[PDB]
């Protein structure tokens, strides 16, 4: 969500929805969330509650 | 004498439950300690804002000050002819600086 | 002779200042005149050295209302020093830095 | 909160020029006391005689819980495997999905975390001494990876 | 509620108290004896004695 | 039933226990203020006394009042006077720890603003810079944008020390009318019976008003008629019109409803939709359990 | 009043009595034995 | 005590691989 | 108090007699320690019919632990957590004493 | 130097109504009372005065006696837009006078 | 230089005076000498304006006993500002008159 | 990649036991805040004495 | 449990019956 | 959703092996 954006659209390509259950959602903040694909995050400078 | 049925009774009660409920008739009220006396968790003091006491008249120490009304114009502090006026009384109680 | 203090008022004021005022965003803070701080805003030293007016969280604002402050809605409430899960963990490693 | 247009003696007094506890607290700092006793001027009375006109602000907070929308005809769940998930299991069809979210502005960069709840099942078989095997099914968001 | 075979019938007391007379003296202990009361057709539970 | 409307509580309402204005003040404290007095008054002289404090320093006092700054050199030097409309701010003082002997300016109230203790004292701002003086009225206060502030100067009471000999003045007080309100503290002691400013009206004390919280009832009790005559409800067909609601006077379906919610869930969890929140007192207020005070230090 | 008239003595209450004056409401000087707090509280 | 007593005294049967049975039969 | 669960004067009762006839009384086939009246409380007690550390009659306590819970004939015990509610007798009963 | 002192005792109860069950076997099981099989109506007098001795203090009080009964209702709809109800209360009935 | 204060003693005076003394009957109160109050006794102003001695709830009386004051056993305890349910209901409407 | 094992685990604990009991061996101690910090209630102060 | 109401057993004491003498 | 659980107890001391 860009800073001061009031809309974020999602487009998911056409694929099966076999055995689909609900959705959930919540909002986070960029500075507080590191990626788990990477082993280290040089840009992650926060040590509070994730 | 190798049976302790006073102890046995205490542990039976806690098996039943309701051991923090107090029953006046049989005088139930298990001994407890406050776990902040038993284990001291020190965390300092939350004092970062200073606290104060002030006089009952809330004006500190006062002194007499005669009222003064200038007797002539001019923007000075000795050319304005600062001298006593009786419309503003005399011996007024006033404090300089903070209380 | 005597001096007057409102113990209750002072305790409430201090409570709010420590737990709410210090946790306001940095935009509501200012650096003192003769205190110089890092230009890194994520350092501990910078955060510590910034000072917040105790009048933003005046002790009688939203007085009689159950209301969370508007600039405190977007502040992570689990970064707080009375997070009691975090405190338990920290003190379970003792009180020194070298553990 | 005080009306800013329907109260006619409204004045916008900023933090600098507010006073209340005059002479008994410092000036905009946790430093020593400064000033003289004087009538306050900061909050406007909203109670008692001479209460100022006001309007309601209403909000809620909700922490530690993600919003959730079940994928079933009735939003109540009558089982793990929903009744609209079985539309596409008794006659599969592919569809696109667009979700449009509207959120409040925020000064800092933010992310949206959307959870698409699936079945993630591993079926572990050990058929022989010192051998373990597994098969990972994941349903409408199948694993594209299968990395070392 | 069941209407029979739990009814008081003749109806007799719900509570008893048992009595004062004399004992053999002791300095640091108080020796008490009872010989109980008897009547007809009831069963006492000793959890309800004090 | 989704009821909407407008609720109004009287001036009885007050959903807090303290005061919201000058809570750190002594209750005996009086404000910086003035009173006229007739002891040596009368005629063309009238003693206007002042009790107060002047808390922030200047560098000179002229007939423009305190000079609180000086304009930086540019081939000129002129002392910047403190504005009468909001300066001397009563929140600004000194950061030594208290000093005496220099030049000092403060504020005061007139004797046309009746005294009240400094403990509930409030006056609404009449300016955006935190001023709070009343506007002058010539016949209308609406177009008149001159505020009512009059300087009063003072000096050490010597005659051979300053004033008459060795001209100067040491203090100035920016005296104003203001809309003085105590909207949450009630006077509880006063020695006179005057409300007009006097020497003895500095001694008035005020304690806060009673906390009085007012809200809708527990489950919206009595917001619908039950067990009533002529106000009884109807649930009936639209054709047949056979009312299937028979309400009896000797029935209570609001008490009955309370007791049912102790047959269902816990009653100690609040709900906001149906406004549930059982009445419960603090049990250490109900039964006072003294234990002294731990105070051996 | 009630029943056949005379001079004065009407406006509710009196009846036959004949029992001993249990509980408080009678309390005053000239004691017996060896009014909220005669009944609330117990000693 | 203060009276309530009502239908569904035990578990409502449903073969727990699923959450149903029938409306009855007719 | 009528329309809400609130009540607060139950301790101001002395006795109730549920008379049926003036040679017998309701439960009064010899059942209670005072078979003709439910005494809620005693002001002075020669017999020792109080129950521990308050005024309440032993008869009344028995009746109100079999009205709210069904315990009395198996000896008194602290009611379970689901048998004891906010309007139930046990947790609102508060004995007290002073000198 | 402790003075001679008497004891004083009381209890409080708040939010409780004093419950007395009725019929036979004081344990509360069931809800129904079989006095319909003792006589169908054959009553005369045999008193029924509940007399409450109460503590006095000052201004007026009211007493509330709840007589516990059944308030059963059957609500039946036999057709669209038709609803009926039959109401029954038996120890204190709501009908039969103009009915 | 120094001054001595008993913080603990003061906070227990304050607790009792607000939560006990103010909710005594008006038989224990008096109207101040130069204060005039309404003749209606159900007005807010009347209730507010009468003053109660803080020495009637001494804060060192009944010391060491659980006891509820006798002129508070006939006072409705759900008419209190520490009625936590009433506070919640009040504050879900906000802190101003006009709602 | 798009699986959140760490989050999933926190949720699992909650649905089983209570999270208000702290454990030390596996270091359970749910993050918290005091509800009088997050939502501030002003009930004033007792300044009548 | 979340119950505030006893059961009745719905049957009196002793099923088993004896002959008149 | 958040919830999803389907692992829970459905529960010479032997027959044949």
Tab-separated table of C-alpha atoms in Angstrom, chain F residues 72-261:
chain	number	residue	atom	x	y	z
F	72	UNK	CA	19.112	42.661	16.454
F	73	UNK	CA	21.422	45.361	15.074
F	74	UNK	CA	21.042	46.423	11.450
F	75	UNK	CA	22.215	50.014	12.123
F	76	UNK	CA	19.417	50.380	14.642
F	77	UNK	CA	18.460	49.095	18.035
F	78	UNK	CA	14.951	49.229	19.409
F	79	UNK	CA	13.532	47.257	22.338
F	80	UNK	CA	10.714	44.887	21.453
F	81	UNK	CA	7.763	45.427	23.803
F	82	UNK	CA	5.697	42.491	25.067
F	83	UNK	CA	2.209	42.402	23.485
F	84	UNK	CA	-0.662	43.298	25.762
F	85	UNK	CA	-2.963	40.744	24.147
F	86	UNK	CA	-1.209	37.580	25.286
F	87	UNK	CA	2.298	38.401	26.538
F	88	UNK	CA	3.158	37.907	29.415
F	89	UNK	CA	2.061	34.295	28.983
F	90	UNK	CA	1.237	32.959	32.459
F	91	UNK	CA	2.870	29.614	31.611
F	92	UNK	CA	6.271	31.233	30.948
F	93	UNK	CA	8.537	31.929	33.920
F	94	UNK	CA	12.237	31.518	34.683
F	95	UNK	CA	14.429	28.398	34.565
F	96	UNK	CA	16.879	29.374	37.329
F	97	UNK	CA	14.637	28.265	40.195
F	98	UNK	CA	13.261	31.688	41.300
F	99	UNK	CA	14.915	35.101	41.266
F	100	UNK	CA	14.120	38.572	42.547
F	101	UNK	CA	15.484	41.991	41.521
F	102	UNK	CA	15.444	42.721	37.787
F	103	UNK	CA	12.352	43.706	35.767
F	104	UNK	CA	9.307	41.439	35.818
F	105	UNK	CA	5.888	41.479	34.205
F	106	UNK	CA	2.863	39.326	34.914
F	107	UNK	CA	-0.895	39.476	34.607
F	108	UNK	CA	-3.763	40.214	36.915
F	109	UNK	CA	-7.520	40.390	36.954
F	110	UNK	CA	-9.557	43.545	37.448
F	111	UNK	CA	-11.905	44.116	40.366
F	112	UNK	CA	-14.759	43.967	37.854
F	113	UNK	CA	-14.025	40.260	37.518
F	114	UNK	CA	-15.225	38.719	40.774
F	115	UNK	CA	-12.712	36.539	42.589
F	116	UNK	CA	-12.914	32.785	42.605
F	117	UNK	CA	-10.156	30.421	43.836
F	118	UNK	CA	-7.452	29.334	41.423
F	119	UNK	CA	-8.431	25.714	41.367
F	120	UNK	CA	-11.405	25.557	39.015
F	121	UNK	CA	-10.709	28.866	37.315
F	122	UNK	CA	-11.193	28.869	33.597
F	123	UNK	CA	-11.798	31.585	31.118
F	124	UNK	CA	-12.274	30.855	27.455
F	125	UNK	CA	-9.725	32.280	25.013
F	126	UNK	CA	-11.035	35.338	23.135
F	127	UNK	CA	-7.974	35.298	20.885
F	128	UNK	CA	-6.065	32.610	18.938
F	129	UNK	CA	-2.792	33.424	20.684
F	130	UNK	CA	-4.189	32.308	24.034
F	131	UNK	CA	-5.384	35.762	25.080
F	132	UNK	CA	-8.561	35.730	27.100
F	133	UNK	CA	-9.337	39.365	27.840
F	134	UNK	CA	-12.866	40.596	27.106
F	135	UNK	CA	-13.290	42.883	24.105
F	136	UNK	CA	-14.025	46.541	24.779
F	137	UNK	CA	-17.633	47.598	24.352
F	138	UNK	CA	-18.361	51.119	23.156
F	139	UNK	CA	-21.917	50.104	22.432
F	140	UNK	CA	-21.086	46.872	20.602
F	141	UNK	CA	-18.248	44.445	21.255
F	142	UNK	CA	-18.666	42.860	17.815
F	143	UNK	CA	-16.758	45.462	15.672
F	144	UNK	CA	-14.529	46.619	18.551
F	145	UNK	CA	-11.262	44.716	18.320
F	146	UNK	CA	-9.533	46.600	21.103
F	147	UNK	CA	-9.045	44.267	24.041
F	148	UNK	CA	-9.320	45.348	27.655
F	149	UNK	CA	-5.829	45.258	29.168
F	150	UNK	CA	-4.511	48.124	31.323
F	151	UNK	CA	-0.915	48.236	32.677
F	152	UNK	CA	-0.374	48.846	36.411
F	153	UNK	CA	3.218	49.556	37.506
F	154	UNK	CA	4.800	49.014	40.921
F	155	UNK	CA	8.143	49.634	42.566
F	156	UNK	CA	9.927	48.914	45.882
F	157	UNK	CA	8.207	50.790	48.708
F	158	UNK	CA	11.240	52.964	49.546
F	159	UNK	CA	11.061	56.688	48.795
F	160	UNK	CA	14.815	57.192	48.853
F	161	UNK	CA	15.170	53.755	47.229
F	162	UNK	CA	13.640	54.037	43.753
F	163	UNK	CA	10.490	55.808	42.523
F	164	UNK	CA	10.406	59.343	43.929
F	165	UNK	CA	14.183	59.437	44.225
F	166	UNK	CA	15.966	57.486	41.480
F	167	UNK	CA	13.139	57.098	38.948
F	168	UNK	CA	12.103	53.622	37.639
F	169	UNK	CA	9.473	50.923	38.260
F	170	UNK	CA	10.229	47.261	38.929
F	171	UNK	CA	7.050	45.285	38.139
F	172	UNK	CA	4.148	45.689	35.708
F	173	UNK	CA	0.900	43.728	35.701
F	174	UNK	CA	-1.281	43.428	32.645
F	175	UNK	CA	-4.666	43.782	34.296
F	176	UNK	CA	-7.669	42.504	32.325
F	177	UNK	CA	-11.347	41.588	32.500
F	178	UNK	CA	-11.952	37.938	31.666
F	179	UNK	CA	-14.925	35.545	31.637
F	180	UNK	CA	-14.153	33.825	34.940
F	181	UNK	CA	-15.962	30.514	35.263
F	182	UNK	CA	-15.610	27.671	37.720
F	183	UNK	CA	-17.538	24.965	35.824
F	184	UNK	CA	-16.668	21.981	38.029
F	185	UNK	CA	-15.659	23.309	41.459
F	186	UNK	CA	-18.007	24.773	44.015
F	187	UNK	CA	-16.961	27.287	46.690
F	188	UNK	CA	-17.115	25.497	50.021
F	189	UNK	CA	-15.681	28.111	52.301
F	190	UNK	CA	-15.759	31.853	52.108
F	191	UNK	CA	-15.586	34.234	55.057
F	192	UNK	CA	-17.634	37.153	53.714
F	193	UNK	CA	-20.938	37.034	51.917
F	194	UNK	CA	-19.750	39.299	49.080
F	195	UNK	CA	-19.107	37.820	45.662
F	196	UNK	CA	-17.420	41.106	44.658
F	197	UNK	CA	-13.611	41.217	44.840
F	198	UNK	CA	-12.301	42.003	48.296
F	199	UNK	CA	-9.230	41.476	50.431
F	200	UNK	CA	-10.960	38.587	52.198
F	201	UNK	CA	-12.036	36.867	48.972
F	202	UNK	CA	-8.487	35.650	48.513
F	203	UNK	CA	-9.203	33.207	51.327
F	204	UNK	CA	-12.048	31.341	49.546
F	205	UNK	CA	-11.537	27.612	49.012
F	206	UNK	CA	-13.242	25.240	46.597
F	207	UNK	CA	-13.532	21.500	46.416
F	208	UNK	CA	-14.646	19.735	43.174
F	209	UNK	CA	-18.247	18.787	42.423
F	210	UNK	CA	-19.480	15.217	42.936
F	211	UNK	CA	-18.779	12.682	40.132
F	212	UNK	CA	-22.105	12.010	38.462
F	213	UNK	CA	-22.090	9.537	35.590
F	214	UNK	CA	-25.348	9.308	33.634
F	215	UNK	CA	-25.993	6.659	30.995
F	216	UNK	CA	-28.714	4.377	29.655
F	217	UNK	CA	-29.827	1.473	31.870
F	218	UNK	CA	-28.341	-2.010	32.001
F	219	UNK	CA	-30.109	-3.752	29.122
F	220	UNK	CA	-32.126	-0.664	28.237
F	221	UNK	CA	-34.445	-1.263	31.167
F	222	UNK	CA	-37.694	0.681	31.041
F	223	UNK	CA	-37.036	1.916	27.495
F	224	UNK	CA	-39.938	-0.226	26.381
F	225	UNK	CA	-43.178	-0.723	28.248
F	226	UNK	CA	-43.692	-4.178	29.641
F	227	UNK	CA	-46.417	-5.232	32.040
F	228	UNK	CA	-48.504	-2.217	31.277
F	229	UNK	CA	-52.004	-0.964	30.593
F	230	UNK	CA	-52.654	0.576	27.214
F	231	UNK	CA	-48.930	0.702	26.436
F	232	UNK	CA	-48.727	-3.066	25.964
F	233	UNK	CA	-47.204	-4.411	22.764
F	234	UNK	CA	-48.841	-6.160	19.846
F	235	UNK	CA	-47.703	-9.116	17.856
F	236	UNK	CA	-50.658	-10.283	15.899
F	237	UNK	CA	-51.652	-11.267	12.379
F	238	UNK	CA	-52.193	-8.570	9.762
F	239	UNK	CA	-55.581	-9.941	8.760
F	240	UNK	CA	-56.873	-11.747	11.839
F	241	UNK	CA	-55.370	-9.233	14.296
F	242	UNK	CA	-55.390	-11.717	17.154
F	243	UNK	CA	-52.875	-10.401	19.642
F	244	UNK	CA	-50.584	-13.135	20.929
F	245	UNK	CA	-49.157	-10.820	23.582
F	246	UNK	CA	-51.006	-10.886	26.885
F	247	UNK	CA	-49.170	-8.733	29.420
F	248	UNK	CA	-50.004	-8.960	33.083
F	249	UNK	CA	-49.402	-6.321	35.711
F	250	UNK	CA	-48.290	-8.981	38.221
F	251	UNK	CA	-45.481	-10.190	35.979
F	252	UNK	CA	-41.997	-8.710	35.677
F	253	UNK	CA	-40.228	-9.457	32.389
F	254	UNK	CA	-37.283	-7.143	32.965
F	255	UNK	CA	-36.162	-8.772	36.217
F	256	UNK	CA	-36.873	-12.141	34.595
F	257	UNK	CA	-34.578	-11.175	31.713
F	258	UNK	CA	-31.716	-10.284	34.150
F	259	UNK	CA	-31.873	-13.611	35.929
F	260	UNK	CA	-31.921	-15.482	32.581
F	261	UNK	CA	-28.508	-14.038	31.664
